[PDB]
Amino acid sequence: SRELIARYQILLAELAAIRADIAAERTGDPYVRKLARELKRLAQEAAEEVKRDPSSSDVNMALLLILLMIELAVRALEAAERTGDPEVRELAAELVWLAVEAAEEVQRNPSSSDVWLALHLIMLAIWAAVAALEAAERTGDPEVRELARELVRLAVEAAEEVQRNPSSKEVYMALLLILIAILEAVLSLLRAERSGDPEKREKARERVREAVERAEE
Amino acid sequence: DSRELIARYQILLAELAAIRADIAAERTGDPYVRKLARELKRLAQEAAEEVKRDPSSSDVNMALLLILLMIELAVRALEAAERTGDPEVRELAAELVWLAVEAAEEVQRNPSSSDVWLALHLIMLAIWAAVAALEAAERTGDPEVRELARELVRLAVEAAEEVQRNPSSKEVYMALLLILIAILEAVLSLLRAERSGDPEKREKARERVREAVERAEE
């Protein structure tokens, strides 16, 4: 039972390390390259912690989230590259750097629920950020592209505060508020994608503008 | 409340999952994939609606979160299984997604049951493994490997049906987990040979996948 889960998680970790390695080889950006090798290091260290001592559920939960964050973060860096936009790449990279820092904290303190939750919210931030930046590249409207950048910049700043103060509930909630704004913006761009008029274009723009103003509070 | 913020967030996640499912329903080109993507859309809308009517039940909120995440995964899995161009890859992924839809309905009907939640969760993990196997096999163009990967996934479909239909059996749960372990060992063998240079590594990868199928079938 527990033996089976441990075998399974070691395989997931070995696979996450290869996925990170592959992305490290494919990328054209030195920051992405550095981070993909860090994600690879983390998956390897996880496989080796589970190997030595599979019997701690704290450690198993800590290492499982790190593995899932890696899988997500690698796909997130690859998707952010697929846009060809250097600023998209750099924003995704700053969020992945924060996730790696929050993973290190989880590794050092696997019994802390606040530290685990901080990494977990940063993984959700990465997911939202990549959705926003991908939706914005499909529009080719320059103002929408800039507003989506503005939203993601706010998320980076708020994810840094969470990473550095995982037990603050107001800081945690400030990030959640920005993710809500980001998804409201994504949902407005998608509903415009599947519609007709440039009336819908300016409608979508106004909703994204309103989302950024909400986040800015 | 913090709960109020989480509920707002999950309603948006659900709205977004419904659109992703719709988009995949429109693009596909296989009628079974189309039918399933519309079911994944329906499940996301019903989840948005249940959180709206009552955000206060932690069982309901957990039941609905897993469904949304399964939808996100299942849609990417059907899309990835179509990108192979192979009608059998398509059909195997579809059978697993159909099982996940059935297991989601059971979760909706019984959100307080831990066994039923875990059954949906293991089937979502099965979908993840199955697509990794079928994608790695498409990379190789070796006909035997592609056939062994199909055999592994067919075993997972059969074992996922048994989990779906008997969520409280521990032996059946473990039987699926054992198959997923075999599938990941096979994926790991294919990717490690995809990297290497030694052209004997193809036959080495093949023999490790053969051994993985043997373990699964036990």
Numbering used by the authors:
A (entry chain B): 2 to 218
B (entry chain A): 1 to 218
Quote the study that presented this structure, word for word:
To investigate the photophysics of special pairs independently of the complexities of native photosynthetic proteins, and as a first step toward creating synthetic photosystems for new energy conversion technologies, we designed C2-symmetric proteins that hold two chlorophyll molecules in closely juxtaposed arrangements. For Chl dimer protein scaffolds, we chose hyperstable C2-symmetric repeat protein dimers containing symmetric pockets with tunable sizes and geometries.
The X-ray crystal structure of SP1 was solved in the ZnPPaM-bound state to 2.0 Å resolution, revealing a special pair geometry closely matching that of purple photosynthetic bacteria. The r.m.s.d. between the ZnPPaM dimer in the SP1 crystal structure and its design model is 0.25 Å. Hydrogen bonds to the ring E ketone group, which has been shown to be important for modulating special pair redox potentials, form with Gln10 in both ZnPPaM molecules, in agreement with the design model. We obtained crystal structures of two holo-state designs: the first, SP1, reproduces the binding geometry of the native purple bacterial reaction center special pair with sub-Ångstrom precision, and the second, SP2, has a distinct geometry with the Chl molecules closer together. Calculations on the SP1−ZnPPaM dimer crystal structure yielded a lower excitonic coupling of 87 cm−1. SP1 exhibits weaker excitonic coupling than SP2 and the BChl special pair of purple photosynthetic bacteria, despite its close structural similarity to the latter. We found that the signs of the CD Cotton effects predicted from the crystal structures of SP1 and SP2 were consistent with the experimental signs in the Qy region.
